[PDB]
Design a protein around this ligand. Structure first.
Ligand code: DCZ
Ligand code: DCZ
Lengths: 185, 191
């Protein structure tokens, strides 16, 4: 029992937070689920996001596992509203962020495989509500400027190359469920 | 929709496999779920059990996460039989095996916390069927002997100290009732 669901997808620095704020005035009639970064930063006093960025070969696995969980919690969360808008999803976690961490060697085969088994079990047990994806398409260099533009201790070591990798993965998934592409440049 | 469920608990080398085999002849009327070791040994060609034992600080986290999943799959698996018997459970994973890996330093705080968030979400979303626990109570020394008397596998180098740690945790849970079980425990002398 889930309302019409829109997912906001795009690279780091694609303006999703700014875009999602346009909907804040409609909170009375729309279910607005911000990406649970605050959950990730305080898993009982542990900042998994910081640990992942600081040491990905060690922390990519637990971090992405906790991402999967929190996204699943958002996807299945109860609301009486007839429209739901989600910042990101279990799908970008899987198809972009986990895939990239596998490709750059931060997730070893067995760790990726464990994450993959969870996704399979989720998809087999739960139909995940996804009616529309709004893809905030950017160029990696503009995304880079947006990250530096905002003070975020965690992401302040992310190379342009990493953003390029995440860009191509969003392109594969979303270009190469209805997808609406917006020029977020 | 799950039948009456019995969970077989106890240390490594407590004789659970031998004990579960006594029920094999009753497969027609009982749902028999062996501990999914074969799944753990072959996660797309990856032996997570071997990797965990060889390098626990690296592999305890993904291993126990996969344990959680496979146990959950067993707990929720469909059967038309009116009795189900399970070798181990999500509860021993949480209360003994994960707790011990946390205490010995193989699971850092953040990794333990991630595993714990999954357990919470599972208990809040799914009532896990558990009607009876049969505790195959052994002494660590006997559990140790059983391991060293059988064929070599991933387990075969676990120190006696590790088995003593797991023993006390099974006692805390199943005898002291210091973990939130609320379930009848039948203790058997598996020595
Ligand atoms: N599946 C995800 C989702 C988000 N992030 C990171 C990218 C940003 O740095 C931050 C906020 O979205 O979290 C991530 O590594 N993996
Ligand atoms: N949660 C669990 C369950 C089992 N095992 C191990 C103990 C045995 O060595 C092997 C087969 O039971 O798996 C484990 O490390 N963690």
């Amino acid at each position: 029992t889930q309302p019409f669901t829109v997912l906001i997808e795009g690279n780091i620095g694609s303006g999703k937070t700014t875009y999602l704020n346009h909907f804040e005035k409609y909170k009375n009639d729309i279910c607005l689920l911000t990406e649970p970064v605050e959950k990730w930063r305080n898993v009982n006093g542990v900042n998994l996001l910081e640990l992942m960025y600081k040491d990905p070969k060690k922390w990519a696995m637990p971090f992405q596992s906790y991402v999967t969980l929190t996204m699943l919690q958002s996807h299945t969360a109860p609301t009486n509203k007839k429209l739901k808008i989600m910042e990101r999803s279990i799908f970008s976690a899987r198809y972009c962020f986990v895939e990239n961490m596998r490709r750059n060697g931060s997730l070893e085969q067995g760790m990726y495989n464990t994450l993959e088994e969870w996704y399979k079990f989720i998809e087999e047990s739960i139909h995940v509500q996804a009616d529309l994806i709004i893809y905030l398409r950017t160029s990696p260099e503009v995304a880079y400027e947006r990250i530096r533009q905002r003070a975020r201790s965690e992401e302040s070591c992310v190379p342009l190359k990493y953003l390029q990798e995440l860009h191509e993965l969003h392109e594969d998934w979303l270009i190469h469920c209805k997808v609406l592409v917006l020029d977020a440049d």
